[PDB]
Every structure is written in C-alpha cells, then in structure tokens.
C-alpha cells in the first residue's frame, strides 16, 4: 500500500559496537506490510522501561552507549528504528512522511507492547515527536530524560522554539542545506561533520542503512517538515505545552550539548522552564547536538539522579 524498500541485511553484517539482536513488528495498525526494527534490551519483565527515540538522520545505534548502562540498572530498553530508517522499512515517497505518521507509529508501538513505567529517551526529532506522546496516555510514563531537543509549536506561542531555524546562518540552514541539496548524500560524511568525535567506523555506521539515495526519503524529509510544520503538528505541540507546564508529575532529568549550533542552551533553558519540576541541566561541554555521542555519562548522571528519588 504505502510503496517501501528495506535495506539489505549484508549492510549491517560489520557495525562497530552493536551487538543488539534484532526484533520486528510488521503487523501494527495502520502500517499495513511495513516492518519496524526496534531493540528490547535488558530484563523483559522489568518494571521499568526506557524507550530511547533517536532523530535525524540517525538510528538506534546513536544509543549503543546508553543501552549497556540502562539495562544494567535492571531495566528492560526499548529503542525503535522510525519508518524510514535504521533497519525498519523505508517509504519511497517523501509525502509519505508526516509527523502524524511517526507519531502514530509511536503510539501503535507503545500499545502493542503495552510499555508501562516508561522513562522517554530523547533527542531532536525524537523529542519533537516524543514530548507529544505522555499526554496521549499520561498513565504509562513516569520519568523523562531530555537531550537537546523542544516543541514544534507556532513562531508566536514559543518564538526559542522557531528562531534556529534562520540563524545562525552555519546552524540549521547548514545542516538542512548539507541533507535536503546533495544529490549524493554521504552519511559518514554528513556524521563526521556534525559529530567530529566518531571514528570513521561509527561514522559508517550511520551510513550503512542507506545503499543509495533511493532509500533516503525519510532523512530528505525531516528537516523540511522542521521549516515548514503542518497544523497537525503546531497543535498537538502547542497542546504538549499544557501537559509538561501543569499536568506532569514525574521525574526529569536533562542534560544539554553546550556545542549545538541548533538546540543548545538557548532553545534548551526555555524547555526547561516549561516542563513542571525539570531540575538544573547538566551542561556536557564538549558535546554537539548528538548528546548521545558522549552517553555513557548522561545514562549514569540520569540514573543517579532517580535513584536518589525512589
């Protein structure tokens, strides 16, 4: 129904520091034939579980740090592939991406593996997308960990959360320019730039998904959808304020990567004012906008502060 590729399986055979086994779902409600990657790490019948959301244009191998600390706490990991990327399908059509069509996939994940005591992992896209999840079903979250990452509500409501994306001019309008413009758009490359500490391995690793551009619609269309939001998307952002300013009540922990020309300090102190109880952020001042790149040490600081709340 929804034409899609899938990567080819040898293109994953040589990862660097990913020894997760694979599971897949083909069978979710709305995703007709499309089948999703996801990790499911730890203790399957832990109380708690930490469903890690990764962003553009990256997979759940931007948590491999993470993951080892958090199941080592005792508690199960969920990490999905979006649609689009990682080893999930791949929908040919950029129209095909909308934010309505990851967030439901989020929610389909969410009841099909009925996740409960959720602590929500995020970052970039993974954020725009997952801060809109909890108000949908507050019952199944308890905890959040934040990284670099706010809403995608209207220029007027939160002007921090609309200003990066025209300045500065080497921020946003490069990154968009270096994933939207090549016609031979090289990953490692795009990852080595952005992320200047990844080996060449890592950086291959971000690369392996995607043969040929082919199977790049999902990377092309996300940054476009943070120029240009749709009404779906402002409203449902702009009702995601509310719930974090008055409704939650759980934990939260957040930690920024001070060198991020696009969701530093100045996008991230005034998330923090909006979510209800966020305490003081851990500043990581060597880490880009890819926090999860120095992760071991986010996982341990976040885990100590929850800890030190039970």
Same mark, same amino acid.
């Given at each position: ?116 005591? %959720?602590?929500?992992?995020?970052? /970039? @896209?993974? !954020? ?6 909890? =108000?949908? $079903? ?102 995601? %304020?509310?719930?974090?300013?008055? /409704? @939650?009540? !759980? ?6 990567? =001070?060198? $991020? ?50």
């Amino acid at each position: 129904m929804i034409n899609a590729i899938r990567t080819p399986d040898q293109r994953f055979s040589n990862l660097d520091q990913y020894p997760f086994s694979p599971n897949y779902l083909d069978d979710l409600p709305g995703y007709p034939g499309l089948r999703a990657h996801y990790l499911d790490e730890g203790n399957s019948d832990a109380e708690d579980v930490f469903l890690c959301l990764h962003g553009e244009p990256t997979w759940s191998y931007l948590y491999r740090k993470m993951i080892p600390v958090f199941a080592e706490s005792g508690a199960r990991v969920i990490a999905p592939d979006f649609f689009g990327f990682g080893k999930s399908d791949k929908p040919v059509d950029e129209e095909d991406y909308t934010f309505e069509f990851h967030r439901n996939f989020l929610l389909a994940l969410i009841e099909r593996l009925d996740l409960r005591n %959720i602590t929500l992992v995020v970052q /970039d @896209w993974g !954020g725009f997308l997952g801060l809109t999840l909890p =108000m949908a $079903d507050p019952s199944r979250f308890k905890r959040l960990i934040i990284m670099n990452a706010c809403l995608m509500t209207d220029p007027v409501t939160q002007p921090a959360f609309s200003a990066f994306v025209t300045q500065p001019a080497d921020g946003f309008t490069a990154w968009k320019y270096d994933l939207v413009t090549p016609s031979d758009l090289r990953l490692d490359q795009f990852m080595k730039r952005w992320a200047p500490t990844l080996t060449e391995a890592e950086a291959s690793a971000y690369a392996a998904p995607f043969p040929d551009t082919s199977y790049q619609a999902g990377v092309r269309k996300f940054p476009k959808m943070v120029a240009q939001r749709d009404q779906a998307c402002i409203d449902i952002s702009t009702e995601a %304020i509310s719930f974090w300013q008055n /409704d @939650w009540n !759980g934990q939260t922990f957040m930690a920024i990567g =001070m060198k $991020d020309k696009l969701l530093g300090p100045d996008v991230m102190y005034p998330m923090k004012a909006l979510i209800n109880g966020c305490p003081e952020p851990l500043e990581i001042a060597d880490a880009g906008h890819f926090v999860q790149e120095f992760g071991e040490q986010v996982a341990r600081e976040a885990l100590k502060h929850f800890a030190e709340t039970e």
